[PDB]
Amino acid sequence: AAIVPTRELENVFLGRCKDYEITRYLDILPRVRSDCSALWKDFFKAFSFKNPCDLDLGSYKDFFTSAQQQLPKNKVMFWSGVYDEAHDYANTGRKYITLEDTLPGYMLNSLVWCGQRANPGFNEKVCPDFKTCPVQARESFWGMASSSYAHSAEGEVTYMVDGSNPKVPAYRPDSFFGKYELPNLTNKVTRVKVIVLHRLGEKIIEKCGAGSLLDLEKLVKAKHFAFDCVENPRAVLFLLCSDNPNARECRL
Amino acid sequence: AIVPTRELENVFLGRCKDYEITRYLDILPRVRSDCSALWKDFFKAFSFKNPCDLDLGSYKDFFTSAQQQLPKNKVMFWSGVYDEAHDYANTGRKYITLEDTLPGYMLNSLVWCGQRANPGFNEKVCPDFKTCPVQARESFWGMASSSYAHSAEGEVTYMVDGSNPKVPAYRPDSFFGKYELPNLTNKVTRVKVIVLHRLGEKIIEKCGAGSLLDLEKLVKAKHFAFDCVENPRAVLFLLCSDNPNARECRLA
Numbered sequence: 269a270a271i272v273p274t275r276e277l278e279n280v281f282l283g284r285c286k287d288y289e290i291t292r293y294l295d296i297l298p299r300v301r302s303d304c305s306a307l308w309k310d311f312f313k314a315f316s317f318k319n320p321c322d323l324d325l326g327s328y329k330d331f332f333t334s335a336q337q338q339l340p341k342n343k344v345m346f347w348s349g350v351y352d353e354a355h356d357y358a359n360t361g362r363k364y365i366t367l368e369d370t371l372p373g374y375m376l377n378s379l380v381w382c383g384q385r386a387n388p389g390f391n392e393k394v395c396p397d398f399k400t401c402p403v404q405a406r407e408s409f410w411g412m413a414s415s416s417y418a419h420s421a422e423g424e425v426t427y428m429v430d431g432s433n434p435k436v437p438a439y440r441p442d443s444f445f446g447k448y449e450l451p452n453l454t455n456k457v458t459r460v461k462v463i464v465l466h467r468l469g470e471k472i473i474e475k476c477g478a479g480s481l482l483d484l485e486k487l488v489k490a491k492h493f494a495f496d497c498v499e500n501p502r503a504v505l506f507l508l509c510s511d512n513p514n515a516r517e518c519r520l
Numbered sequence: 521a522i523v524p525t526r527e528l529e530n531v532f533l534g535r536c537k538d539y540e541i542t543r544y545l546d547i548l549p550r551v552r553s554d555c556s557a558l559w560k561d562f563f564k565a566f567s568f569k570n571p572c573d574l575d576l577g578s579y580k581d582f583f584t585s586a587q588q589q590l591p592k593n594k595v596m597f598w599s600g601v602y603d604e605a606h607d608y609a610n611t612g613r614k615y616i617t618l619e620d621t622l623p624g625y626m627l628n629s630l631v632w633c634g635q636r637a638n639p640g641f642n643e644k645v646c647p648d649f650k651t652c653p654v655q656a657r658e659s660f661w662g663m664a665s666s667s668y669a670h671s672a673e674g675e676v677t678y679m680v681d682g683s684n685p686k687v688p689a690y691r692p693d694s695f696f697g698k699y700e701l702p703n704l705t706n707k708v709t710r711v712k713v714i715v716l717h718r719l720g721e722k723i724i725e726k727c728g729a730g731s732l733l734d735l736e737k738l739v740k741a742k743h744f745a746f747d748c749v750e751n752p753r754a755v756l757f758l759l760c761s762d763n764p765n766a767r768e769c770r771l772a
């Protein structure tokens with residue numbers, strides 16, 4: 269009902285950066301060139317000392333240029349509407365990289381903050397519902413983070429979707445994938461591998477080769493990428509079956 | 521040779537702060553000591569001592585101060601099976617592990633030791649864990665285990681490797697046998713054993729036989745209820761996700 273910013277933004281941000289730098293993803297992802305306090309300054313100039321709605325997609329540009337890590341070939345995952353499953357399956361960078369394993373992704377994941385014109389330059393009480401803010405403002409941070417990450421992808425990329433939502437198609441132009449990732453994929457990308465997630469016990473809404481997925485197949489091949497698509501592949505199925513052993517789809 | 525974690529203080533501080541503000545919020549409670557005080561407690565336990573001058577009480581003030589009350593029926597202990605038990609407990613949402621609690625999360629996989637000379641810790645090198653006496657070598661994780669075991673309430677779970685020919689499911693000298701089981705209080709009402717049979721390996725340890733029967737008697741003598749299961753479905757699926765063609769991952 270009121271939307272409360274994260275406490276001690278700097279401290280938390282600097283805390284994760286430092287943790288990350290020294291101890292996270294060591295063999296999986298490169299360290300980045302800039303120190304944590306340099307990263308803080310690029311992050312903070314993007315919103316401090318302006319209205320909370322006073323942002324666009326240029327705003328965090330310098331932050332993302334500094335934070336961008338080269339990303340391992342064939343490992344990049346995108347996801348829509350399946351945060352829990354896509355992450356369980358990407359298994360913390362072992363099998364796939366998500367945006368949330370990346371430095372910027374990790375530092376800001378789940379955090380809430382916004383600017384205010386008066387000192388200390390950010391609000392510590394309340395943030396607006398970002399439905400009140402123009403889209404470029406609401407989406408300045410994660411939108412650009414998605415774009416920067418997709419622009420760094422190389423080789424085969426993977427896309428996990430929900431193909432069980434009757435209200436939300438598997439693929440949409442209007443998702444973060446559809447707005448910021450698919451169209452920023454460069455000619456170092458060779459293939460989009462789609463994994464459709466049919467939630468256990470639920471009506472199958474979207475199918476490979478049909479509907480929004482066919483719309484995507486087309487978008488993909490039109491970008492010159494190879495394309496494939498699987499519906500609950502054994503590896504993913506088992507993972508769903510772990511949280512719902514009895515589900516008919518998991519029968520021994 | 522073994523390399524200490526760099527910037528141990530900032531790494532500790534950074535994790536402590538990230539934890540306090542953002543981690544396990546609806547799952548585990550905050551401690552009242554602030555980060556810096558906890559650092560003071562942690563540092564005093566091993567600083568300005570021989571790297572091997574450590575006993576089961578060196579870190580007592582750290583833990584007292586860092587110990588969190590642990591939610592009923594969620595406590596898991598583990599042996600021989602870090603990845604599976606951790607994947608299974610699923611970041612404190614199915615069960616809690618020590619690694620989810622403040623102290624285990626701040627220190628997981630870090631490497632530090634004291635020296636008598638200024639600045640009181642060693643940044644270059646720490647002794648191989650085997651030159652050092654058991655009580656000093658187990659001085660940090662051993663007391664973490666006792667403290668955490670001491671805090672468990674209701675039904676506790678113990679996940680074990682049933683396929684190690686060299687290492688019993690239960691051993692009077694594991695961390696479980698030495699630090700956890702004996703620190704279980706009257707707050708505890710049951711010990712639930714989960715025996716993990718690795719996919720495509722000889723089944724070695726069985727429920728009601730061998731070390732598991734030894735455990736069963738020790739547990740009952742302590743007036744706790746006892747069950748034990750081998751590869752329950754939820755866990756089996758978890759293993760099959762990682763190796764789906766396994767004979768045992770067979771489906772309809």
Ligand SMILES: Nc1c2nc(Br)n3c2nc[n+]1[C@@H]1O[C@H](COP(=O)(O)OP(=O)(O)OC[C@H]2O[C@@H]3[C@H](O)[C@@H]2O)[C@@H](O)[C@H]1O
Binds near residue numbers: 601618619624694696
């Ligand atoms: N929390 C930890 C822990 N954290 C780390 Br980084 N280690 C740990 N070992 C035990 N425990 C606690 O003690 C119990 C398991 O101890 P066990 O005697 O069965 O030991 P094994 O499982 O065979 O090996 C664990 C290895 O990882 C390291 C150790 O250096 C060690 O080399 C758990 O319930 C847990 O709460």
Ligand SMILES: Nc1ncnc2c1nc(Br)n2[C@@H]1O[C@H](COP(=O)(O)OP(=O)(O)OC[C@H]2OC[C@H](O)[C@@H]2O)[C@@H](O)[C@H]1O
Binds near residue numbers: 347
């Ligand atoms: N732990 C968590 N931490 C943070 N957020 C969590 C969360 N858990 C959930 Br559950 N969400 C939210 O689920 C909402 C629905 O968005 P969506 O339809 O699933 O996917 P897209 O629009 O395609 O954006 C995704 C693409 O851009 C980023 C990444 O590269 C990915 O590929 C999101 O707004 C999340 O905030």
